[PDB]
Structure 1
């Protein structure tokens, strides 16, 4: 009985550790995409300001 009680709780506790790791994986995908656009925007201004002052 104890090896069935244990092997079913390994099924549930490894299931909520993949829901919480996929809930966390979308929130870092939005922050990765805001920051990816913000670096192309930032280093574009430095080239324009470098050429305008020249």
Structure 2
């Protein structure tokens, strides 16, 4: 239970580290989706 104490400690920190990198990539894709959906809407409107 000492070994588990320090093992699950490391897992918690590693999870927070993965949560940051995942959030940064999620927000890239979130912004890219809005950017690209808009371009499509606006490109179609300007053809009329």
| TM-score, with structure 2 as normaliser | 0.90
Moved over 6 A (4+): none
5+ residue gaps, structure 1: 1-6
Quote the residue 1:46 is aligned against.
Answer: 40
Residue correspondences, number? 48
Quote how far apart the aligned CAs of 1:19 are.
0.7
Quote the residue 2:18 is aligned against.
Answer: 24
| TM-score, with structure 1 as normaliser | 0.82
5+ residue gaps, structure 2: none
Larger Rg: 1
